[PDB]
Structures are given as C-alpha cells and as structure tokens.
Ligand binder design. Sequence first.
Ligand code: 5VK
Length: 156
Amino acid sequence: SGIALSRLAQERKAWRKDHPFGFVAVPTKNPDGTMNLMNWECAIPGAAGTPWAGGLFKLRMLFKDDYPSSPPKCKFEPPLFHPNVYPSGTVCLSILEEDKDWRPAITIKQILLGIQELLNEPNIQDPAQAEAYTIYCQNRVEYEKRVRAQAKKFAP
Ligand SMILES: CCOC(=O)CCc1ccc(-c2ccccc2O)c(O)c1
C-alpha cells in the first residue's frame, strides 16, 4: 500500500530525529531481507519513580494496508500483567481503536507515549484481563508488588 508505506517512511524519519529517551521502534525485515515497514519491534521503558521503573517492555506494532485510516495493533511480546492488556498481549486503549479515539494524524511517538502512560495508570472502565484488573481493584499494594516483580523480570 503506497499510502501506508509513504506515511510509515515519514514516521521512521521523524522517530529518528526526535524520540523519547530509552524507547525503541524499528521496522523488521521481509524474508528476502528488505525492510518491512508494516511490522515494527518496539520497546517501552518503565517511567522512573514508578513500580514500572527499570523494566523495558517489548511490543510489536502491526500496521494494516489501509493505515493511517486504521490504528496499528499493538501487542506486548511476551504478554504483560496489566488491567488493560489482553492475555494475548494486545493493548486496549481508546486511541488504538478506529471507532473510538484514533485519528490518522497520531504518530508512533504519540502511540508509544500513550501506552507508557497507560502502563502506570490503568483504565478501570475497560478491563482487558481478569487477574490484573481484580488485583488492582482488591489490593493496590499487591498489585504494585506484582508490577515491580514484572519490571525486574524485564530489566535490560
Ligand atoms: C529491535 C532491536 O533490538 C533492540 O533495539 C533492543 C531492544 C528490543 C526492542 C524490541 C524487541 C522486540 C520487540 C517486539 C517483538 C520482538 C522483539 O524482539 C527486542 O527483543 C529488543
């Protein structure tokens, strides 16, 4: 898709000039070794001073041929403990749904900062996984304990 590929080249240029420290976003390769702009491997650092601190959380960003009409699918690989991340790893966030708050102008940097913000501030209104949501509601201390253990597990 020429439209998607043109926009994704624009995103790649912008990202290299200006990206938040400690974040990673890199296109993958096709089986012939050429660049695949439709599939990016990314990493989000936990914010300092939070239970997420010290972790580097890997996620894949998958673009459909009609991007930027549609948002990319964002999937933590491996899946994470968080009330708004599905057991599959897929992130549940309003800016990542075409019918909700997605706008074609939204950039990869804005998506990744949006997901980082979500990590430290769950949305109790759209629970995506039972366990993390239930613990968040029932025992915030236990929740943060689980988050810190996870951050340690994913230290780079
Ligand atoms: C992407 C090149 O590797 C680095 O920049 C180190 C940080 C990193 C960033 C992303 C990934 C990753 C993310 C999603 C899916 C598979 C991966 O390997 C990973 O394994 C490692």
